[PDB]
Amino acid sequence: KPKIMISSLDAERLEILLETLSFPGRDDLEAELARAEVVDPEEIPPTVVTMNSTVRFRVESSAEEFCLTLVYPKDVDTSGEKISILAPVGSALLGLAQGDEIEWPKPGGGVLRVRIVEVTY
Amino acid sequence: KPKIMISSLDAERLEILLETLSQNAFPGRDDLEAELARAEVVDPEEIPPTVVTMNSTVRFRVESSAEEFCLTLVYPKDVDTSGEKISILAPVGSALLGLAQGDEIEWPKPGGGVLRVRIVEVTY
């Protein structure tokens, strides 16, 4: 499996956050962090999903797009734009890259299938 | 096909919420609106205890490990930093409303794969 790329600071901060818990994805997230490429932030391409980045998604079956900003738990907003690293979906976004696909439950039934089209700060 | 059931209170609050956030194109909004528009609006009393409503706590079992965990479906005002609340606006959260005990859903596993869970209990 490819390894995720993450800054030293985000690795440290996440390790500590995860250490203090007790979510379903905790162990899987920890396993990614354990084998990650921990580098200077400037070494991580802007196509990689990092903590505090904004991810633009396109629904594969249409032109439709939306954004989510991946954040630490205290930084989540109340208007549908931010998503916690501890949240379902949020925990899986970390270290994905532009072009990657992801899917999750669609309200009312079925699966929302999306592709990452851009990552920004 | 099958309409979900909501209380009058929750139908009303969600409608005002969605009106207030008119410009916020969150994932699955169109689908949640559609589901709300055709929902059957009942008194809280004849929505069964096994149906997920706003402020319900949902207990889940993961199929691979039989670990269990909970999420409480809340309005934006009530999410906290614990990881146990989930907004009606959030991925997964928006799909929980109207589901019932026994229903299965799945979402991404960090590093790849799916976490598939069954709703083991609903509590208000």
TrEMBL record, chain A:
Keywords: Elongation factor, Protein biosynthesis. Residues 2-39 form the Regulator of nucleoside diphosphate kinase N-terminal domain. GO terms for molecular function: DNA binding; RNA polymerase binding; translation elongation factor activity. Coiled coil: none annotated. Pfam families: GreA_GreB, Rnk_N. One of its GO terms (biological process) is DNA-templated transcription elongation. Residues 46-121 form the Transcription elongation factor GreA/GreB C-terminal domain. PANTHER family: REGULATOR OF NUCLEOSIDE DIPHOSPHATE KINASE (PTHR30437:SF5), TRANSCRIPTION ELONGATION FACTOR GREA (PTHR30437). This is Prokaryotic transcription elongation factor GreA/GreB. It comes from Nitrosomonas europaea (strain ATCC 19718 / CIP 103999 / KCTC 2705 / NBRC 14298). The gene is rnk.
